[PDB]
């Protein structure tokens, strides 16, 4: 296996999903056959027995771990090796082990995590562990990083005293459990002065590279057990060699074959399509205040913006609106002229009814107009409430693209559930760069399963889950299916303005059968399956077509006077001549224009002197 199979992980902390079994099962479903945990390991409410075999396969966790209120005897997390811990439990600890006991004095007993030997960041918490045994003997300094040992507040209160006794041969009575295998494996303390980083043994040869995390199998940079910063294939790197090496000699830049792009923890040669590529040479997710997203030959580039910038409006639950966990009456204010939404959009029920707890006013249904300005979203969209007043999604009329670089649970770029809406009415939505679409739980929402999604998806692995929406059986009876003018490809509603692609032609945004060529009020021409109105100068023709272009240059006949094919209002006066000299022409009964005689100052009503009396 090239990559390790991942599970998304949860941040819900102490939220119990129904009963203990229900939560346990949600866990089982999530973390079954999981190799690397993207999120957090929340082992909460694990009661007596509830055998946790499937957890053995878990190797590491990006975030913190919370083991709380687990009366279970055995928690076999033997193959768990390391915790990056980029997030802390309550900004304090990387691991929180609390209240593992029952009323009857039965709690966590066996915990043979013999391979867990490193924690990059964060501290650890211990309290209320009566049944806990063996783990006590762990000499933590090997594992935890020096920076945090002051913040570490842990205590082994082995009140029961019914515990096992480490196999003698274990390194200085440090053991995770019974048997020779469960002896605590220490790879830090025995690294002699010379070796600053991790080591295999005491022999100075065994100095591992600094860039190793869990240890190494040799001194070479590739041999690291777990790459600290970046995992460039086998090798473990600090920062991807930039695109071009600075030449010491010439004081110039030379193209570097080693040059790569820093995408998260990987030095790659190519970013995921949707992601923004900088001239710096790192795959990024959004531009800062400096500049906006400059389209540069079909890839996003943060080319510097001169003077006023389009800027980025921090989406909900990010940057300047991280406190807020749903767009409400308060935060919505700061969305006046938003063109780029650098974040997500959470529309929760509490926003509309208002929250007593947070003292947030009820969101006014009338204030949904603000959203017309929004044109794109870097991340995903969640809508779990909609006002009674409106059934159509007017608010998102001019919502074009959802970039969805960040997805809810890394799986979905959009979610609309438990709504009262009837028609989708999204008549500018023509692309979802990446991320899945889930439409479910809509009582009376037609038009749902009519769109051709394959067109809108651009990336491998974009799935679609549209279920429990108003059956076509009912919709078709009341005529809530694709209008005559909407192509079979897809339709957003019953209106002719909500068609994805028009059958034949269209007047602006509204599909129609055929352009008004012969008769009708707007005399129009057909360009690119669209009808555009001729310039007023173009005189309507009963039988012949009126015009073949927007400008007045393409009129067959002029409404008033004629000056060639270019139909001008009247014979030009002051038209560009010699060094911008005013030119005077005279009209005729046949609407023909000819030059006057120089003499006539007040214009001329005929050739020569005879034209202009005074």
């Amino acid at each position, epitope marked *: 296996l090239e990559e390790k199979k991942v599970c998304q992980g949860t941040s819900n902390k102490l939220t119990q999903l129904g009963t203990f079994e229900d939560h346990f099962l949600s866990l089982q479903r999530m973390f079954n056959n999981c190799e690397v945990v993207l999120g957090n390991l929340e082992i909460t409410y694990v009661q007596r027995n509830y055998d946790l075999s499937f957890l053995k396969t878990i190797q590491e966790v990006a975030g913190y771990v919370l083991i709380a209120l687990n009366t279970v005897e055995r928690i076999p997390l033997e193959n768990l090796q390391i915790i990056r811990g980029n997030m802390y439990y309550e900004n304090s600890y990387a691991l929180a082990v609390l209240s593992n006991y029952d009323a009857n004095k039965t709690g966590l007993k066996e915990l043979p995590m013999r391979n867990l030997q490193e924690i990059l960041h964060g501290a650890v918490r211990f309290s209320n562990n009566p049944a806990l045994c063996n783990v006590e003997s762990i000499q933590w300094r090997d594992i935890v990083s020096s920076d945090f040992l002051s913040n570490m507040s842990m205590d082994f209160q082995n009140h029961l005293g019914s515990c096992q006794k480490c196999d003698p041969s274990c390194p200085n009575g440090s053991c995770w459990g019974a048997g020779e295998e469960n002896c605590q494996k220490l790879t830090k*303390i025995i690294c002699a002065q010379q070796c600053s980083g991790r080591c295999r043994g005491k022999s100075p040869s065994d100095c591992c590279h600094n860039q190793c995390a869990a240890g190494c199998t040799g001194p070479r940079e590739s041999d690291c057990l777990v790459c600290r910063k970046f995992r460039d294939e086998a090798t473990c790197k600090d920062t991807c060699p930039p695109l071009m090496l600075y030449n010491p000699t010439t004081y110039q830049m030379d193209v570097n074959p080693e040059g790569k792009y820093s995408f998260g923890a990987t030095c790659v040669k190519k970013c995921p399509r949707n992601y923004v590529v900088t001239d710096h040479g790192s795959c990024v997710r959004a531009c800062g205040a400096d500049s906006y997203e400059m389209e540069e030959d079909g890839v996003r580039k943060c080319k510097k913006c001169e003077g006023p910038c389009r800027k980025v409006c921090n989406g909900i639950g990010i940057g300047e609106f991280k406190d807020s966990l749903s767009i409400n009456a308060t935060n919505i204010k700061h969305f006046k002229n938003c063109t780029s939404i650098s974040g997500d959009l959470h529309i929760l029920p509490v926003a509309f009814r208002g929250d007593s707890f947070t003292h947030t006013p009820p969101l006014d249904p009338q204030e949904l107009d603000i959203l017309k300005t929004v044109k794109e979203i870097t991340g995903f969209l969640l809508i779990q409430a909609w006002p009674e007043n409106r059934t159509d999604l007017h608010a998102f009329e001019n919502l074009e693209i959802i970039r969805g670089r960040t997805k809810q649970h890394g799986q979905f770029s959009l979610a609309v559930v438990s709504l009262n809406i009837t028609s989708l009415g999204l008549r500018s939505l023509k692309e979802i760069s990446d991320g899945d679409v889930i439409i479910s739980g809509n009582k009376n929402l037609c038009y749902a399963n009519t769109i051709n999604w394959k067109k809108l998806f651009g990336t491998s692995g974009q799935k679609t889950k549209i279920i429990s929406n108003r059956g076509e059986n009912s919709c078709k009876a009341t005529g809530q299916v694709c209008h005559a003018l909407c192509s079979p490809e897809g339709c957003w509603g019953p209106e002719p303005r909500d068609c994805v692609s028009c059958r034949n032609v269209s007047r602006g945004r509204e599909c129609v059968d055929k352009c008004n060529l012969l008769e009708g009020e707007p005399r129009e021409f057909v360009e690119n399956s669209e009808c555009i109105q001729c310039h007023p100068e173009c005189l309507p023709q009963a039988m012949n077509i009126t015009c073949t272009g927007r400008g007045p240059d393409n009129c067959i006949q002029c409404a008033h006077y004629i000056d060639g094919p270019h139909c001008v209002k009247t014979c030009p006066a002051g038209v560009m001549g010699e060094n911008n000299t005013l030119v005077w022409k005279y009209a005729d009964a046949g609407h023909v224009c000819h030059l006057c005689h120089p003499n006539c100052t007040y214009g001329c009503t005929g050739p020569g002197l005879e034209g202009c009396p005074t």
Partner: nanobody
Amino acid sequence: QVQLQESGGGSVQAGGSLKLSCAASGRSFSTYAMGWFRQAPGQDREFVATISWTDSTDYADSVKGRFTISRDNAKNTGYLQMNSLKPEDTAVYYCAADRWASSRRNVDYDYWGQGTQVTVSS
């Protein structure tokens, strides 16, 4: 997070017997592993012995079989029986402690006693 203090440093006849002690100034003594270190005058500071907070002993090879480190949780003290002494033993002796490690590296113990001179006759 607690202080320390030695006792017993002095002069003895080559091949004699002695008994050193290290008293912890504070609380939670049982939680701290205890270690002895020595520095020969005009040399660098070197490891002597240790005993984990889990009551696991460990000796340096020089003193192994001649020295017997020990600890008494009740009295918050530690001891070191030293027999068949050698003129090579003359050094400045310290005792360090630590809750979260029982290693041999001088760097891993960050709470230190103040030490005493120990001499063995020529």
